[PDB]
Design a protein around this ligand. Structure first.
Ligand SMILES: [Cl-]
Ligand SMILES: [Cl-]
Length: 175
């Protein structure tokens, strides 16, 4: 397997097959391994980026996940003041996810890499190691409900949030 984005070392996590062949996908079990500190001696910090709309996130998200559905907010939160490790011997990892392990997560993942490359001298990167959560929140919740809060799941197409979906869409950069 290829090295991470800045060609400094191998990917740390075991991966599974996903829709986007060139992106790295991880299972819910691996996500839990990270959350339970199985890689604490190597990974100083990781950020779970929930790319779903606010109402979806509010209806149930992975503990500690940050909701960054808009490109400009994801870029500000991640690249304005890059999240770095307390030791340049430890790793920083990003994990993006959406609802059905479809397009919103992969899209943001590619966007961040594009911006990361743009503000660095090749091949250096602030976030060389990024993954997509296979199955999204839809598959994570039924596997590890106690790693979610609240313990529920609100689909993007929930019948009671049709207007909320439209309201959010009108804040995006492109459609
Ligand atoms: Cl997939
Ligand atoms: Cl956007």
């Amino acid at each position: 397997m290829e090295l991470i984005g800045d060609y400094s070392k191998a990917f740390l996590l075991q991966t599974v097959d996903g829709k986007h062949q060139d992106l790295k996908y991880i299972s819910p079990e691996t996500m839990v391994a990270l959350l339970t500190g199985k890689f604490s001696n190597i990974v100083d910090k990781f950020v779970i980026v929930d790319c779903r709309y606010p109402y979806e996130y509010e209806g149930g998200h992975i503990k500690t996940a940050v909701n960054l559905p808009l490109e400009r907010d994801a870029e500000s939160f991640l690249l304005k003041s890059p999240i770095a490790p307390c030791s340049l011997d430890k790793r920083v990892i990003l994990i993006f996810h959406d609802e059905f392990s479809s397009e919103r997560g992969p899209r943001m993942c590619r966007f961040i890499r594009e911006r990361d490359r743009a503000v660095n001298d090749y091949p250096s990167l602030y976030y060389p190691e990024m993954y997509i959560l296979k199955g999204g929140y839809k598959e994570f919740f039924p596997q590890h409900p106690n790693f979610c809060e609240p313990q529920d799941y609100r689909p993007m197409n929930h019948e009671a949030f049709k207007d909320e979906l439209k309201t959010f869409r009108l804040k995006t950069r492109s459609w």
